[PDB]
Amino acid sequence: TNTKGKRRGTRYMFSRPFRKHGVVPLATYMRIYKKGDIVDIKGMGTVQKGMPHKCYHGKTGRVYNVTQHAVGIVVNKQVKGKILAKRINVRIEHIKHSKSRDSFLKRVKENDQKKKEAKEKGTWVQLKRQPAPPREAHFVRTNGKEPELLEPIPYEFMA
Partner 1 sequence: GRRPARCYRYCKNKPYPKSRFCRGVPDAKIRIFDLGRKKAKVDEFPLGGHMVSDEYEQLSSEALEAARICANKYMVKSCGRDGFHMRVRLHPFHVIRINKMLSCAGADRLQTGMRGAFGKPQGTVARVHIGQVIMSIRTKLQNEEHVIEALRRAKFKFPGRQKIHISKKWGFTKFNADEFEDMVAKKCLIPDGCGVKYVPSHGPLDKWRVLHS
Partner 2 sequence: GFVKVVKNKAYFKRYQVKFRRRREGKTDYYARKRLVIQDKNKYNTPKYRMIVRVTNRDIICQIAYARIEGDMIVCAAYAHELPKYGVKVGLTNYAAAYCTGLLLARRLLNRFGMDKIYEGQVEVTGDEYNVESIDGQPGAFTCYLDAGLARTTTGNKVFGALKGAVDGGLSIPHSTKRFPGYDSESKEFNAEVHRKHIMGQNVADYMRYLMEEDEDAYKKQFSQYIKNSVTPDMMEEMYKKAHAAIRENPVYEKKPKKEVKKKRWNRPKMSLAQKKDRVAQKKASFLRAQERA
Partner RNA sequence: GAGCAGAAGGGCAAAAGCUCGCUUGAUCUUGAUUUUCAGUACGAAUACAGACCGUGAAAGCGGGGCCUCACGAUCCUUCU
Partner RNA sequence: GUCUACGGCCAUACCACCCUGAACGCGCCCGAUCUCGUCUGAUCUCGGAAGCUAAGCAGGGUCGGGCCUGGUUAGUACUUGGAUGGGAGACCGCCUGGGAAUACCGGGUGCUGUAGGCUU
Which positions touch partner 1 (CB under 8 A)?
Answer: 157-159
Q: Give me the count of residues in the chain.
A: 159
Least Å distance between CB 4 and partner 1?
Answer: 24
Least Å distance between CB 93 and Mg ion?
Answer: 15
Query: In angstroms, rounded to a whole number, what is the distance separating the alpha carbons of residues 42 and 14?
Result: 9
First to last CA, the chain: 45
Residue 66 φ/ψ, nearest 5 degrees? -120, 135
Query: CA 14, 19, 20 angle in degrees (round to 5)?
Result: 50
Least Å distance between CB 79 and Mg ion?
Answer: 21
Q: Which of 10, 13, 33, 54 binds partner 2 (CB under 8 A)?
A: 33
Q: Is position 106 an interface residue for partner 2 (rule: CB under 8 A)?
A: no
Residue 26 interacts, among partner 1, RNA, Mg ion, none and using kind-specific CB cut-offs from 5 to 8 Å, with: RNA
